[PDB]
Ligand binder design. Structure first.
Ligand SMILES: CC(=O)Nc1cccc2nonc12
Ligand SMILES: [Zn+2]
Ligand SMILES: [Zn+2]
Ligand SMILES: [Zn+2]
Length: 459
């Protein structure tokens, strides 16, 4: 029960307008065959072109919505649309390209998928709302066979060249002409009433329908992400390391300790209300304060309404002391808050486009994150960069230039000259901080917060 049996039934009702007469009784086996491919009863790690929902969820980074529209089937030109916003026109002889034969179109398809995917995934998963032309177009740019490795590396093969008769991964694919051993999922098999737009638009106002192949491709992927990551959430699914996941996570731990430790020293709150992950630990364990936890799972859909977190009757008095929202996304933070809030608009390899302006942030786990909203922060200000240490000035054991900074808040800087230890630590913390920011996190704090109040914690 790992792979999708090719003897599983495929509902063909979605297909019968592009493919009139299609049998109601249909297997993957007979569909793959009808699509022009032969599986040759092959036990070589590619049991089925089509995959389960579970397999698709584990391979979310590989998702490319795909849609084909009859432009006028062998007779007529086809519009190919990918969730990259690319539209290509194939002739049998937002980006909108003119009509060209398949022999060139297949080259553009390999280049596009390779650039999109080489830093995301070892494969492609075409995400479909299958009506027939997409499935019957695959033979013109897809070759299948046994699992293979790259001719230039140890990564599984995703592309094939008819020029050289060789196989490459996404990294090594330049000049290759065929997609090799793609995967695919038909969203329409999930049990939906009515068309794509009627179903997409239930959940998302951000993607319109210009009635072009790339728009349906985007809607198809959006609806899929809605179904697998918004409405359904699984924090048991691990995802591979593909970037700076580990540095970013370490940075997050170090900034959080820094910022909260400073806020407590600066304003000496008698109570901190820690609102979010039910697994959360005291980020400043030595701090004098009354630490009070409130459980909230990450809101994958709409931001939490502060009315429903706080009221319905705790310390009850969240207006006492300070509220810590560390990636606990609410509509409008109270004025007495420390906040980390993920900016869904960031471009990274970790952040995939999501549903209704939100984004899918994949780092160990997948977190669909509601659209970043500036109005949430109206009672707060941006938290300026600073470094604070009360640790003793003492080197122990990295070559030096003397550090000069207004934001190095230490005894040594108070004394006019930053010691080597605090300068190493300062530069390390600044690097962590820059990592986290560029990874798309944003920091906000109560308006009264002033690093000037930290200097008198040394006397
Ligand atoms: C620990 C972790 O990766 N959590 C998160 C990252 C990005 C956005 C999030 N929204 O809630 N939790 C989020
Ligand atoms: Zn390679
Ligand atoms: Zn959408
Ligand atoms: Zn020092």
């Amino acid at each position: 029960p790992t792979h999708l049996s090719v003897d599983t039934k495929f509902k063909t009702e979605g297909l019968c307008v592009d493919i009139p007469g299609i049998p109601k009784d249909m297997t993957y086996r007979r569909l793959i065959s009808m699509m022009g491919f032969k599986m040759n009863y092959q036990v070589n790690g590619y049991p089925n072109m089509f995959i389960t929902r579970e397999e698709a969820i584990r391979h979310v980074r590989a998702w490319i919505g795909f849609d084909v529209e009859g432009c006028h089937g062998t007779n007529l030109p086809l519009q190919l649309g990918f969730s990259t916003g690319v539209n290509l026109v194939a002739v049998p002889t937002p980006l909108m390209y003119k009509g060209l034969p398949w022999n060139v179109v297949r080259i553009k398809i390999v280049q596009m998928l390779s650039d999109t995917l080489k830093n995301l995934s070892d494969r492609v998963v075409f995400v479909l709302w299958a009506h027939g032309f997409e499935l019957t177009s695959m033979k013109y740019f897809v070759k299948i066979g046994p699992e293979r490795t790259c001719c230039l590396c140890d990564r599984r093969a995703t592309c094939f060249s008819t020029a050289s008769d060789t196989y490459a991964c996404w990294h090594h694919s330049i000049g290759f002409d065929y997609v090799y051993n793609p995967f695919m999922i038909d969203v329409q098999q999930w049990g939906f009433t009515g068309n794509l737009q009627s179903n997409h638009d239930l959940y998302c106002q951000v993607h319109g329908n210009a009635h072009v192949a790339s728009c349906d491709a985007i809607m198809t992927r959006c609806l899929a992400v809605h179904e697998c990551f918004v409405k359904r959430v699984d924090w048991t699914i691990e995802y591979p390391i593909i970037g700076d996941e580990l540095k970013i996570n370490a940075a997050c731990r170090k900034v959080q300790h820094m910022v909260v430790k400073a806020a407590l020293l600066a304003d000496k709150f008698p109570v901190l209300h820690d609102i979010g992950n039910p697994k959360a630990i005291k980020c400043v364990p030595q701090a004098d304060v009354e630490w009070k936890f409130y459980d909230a799972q990450p809101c994958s859909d709409k931001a939490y309404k502060i009315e429903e977190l706080f009221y319905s009757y705790h310390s009850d008095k969240f207006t006492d002391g300070v509220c810590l929202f560390w990636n606990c996304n609410v509509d409008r933070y109270p004025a007495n808050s420390i906040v980390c809030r993920f900016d869904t608009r960031v471009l990274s390899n970790l952040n995939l486009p999501g549903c209704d302006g939100g984004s899918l942030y994949v780092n160990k786990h997948a977190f669909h994150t509601p659209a970043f909203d500036k109005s949430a922060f109206v009672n707060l200000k941006q938290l300026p960069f600073f470094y604070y240490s009360d640790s003793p000035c003492e080197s122990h054991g990295i070559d030096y230039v003397p550090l000069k900074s207004a934001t190095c808040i230490t005894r040594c800087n108070l004394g006019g000259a930053v010691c080597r230890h605090h300068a190493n630590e300062y530069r390390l913390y600044l690097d962590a901080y820059n990592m986290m920011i560029s990874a798309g996190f944003s920091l906000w704090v109560y308006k009264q917060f002033d690093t000037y109040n930290l200097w008198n914690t040394f006397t």
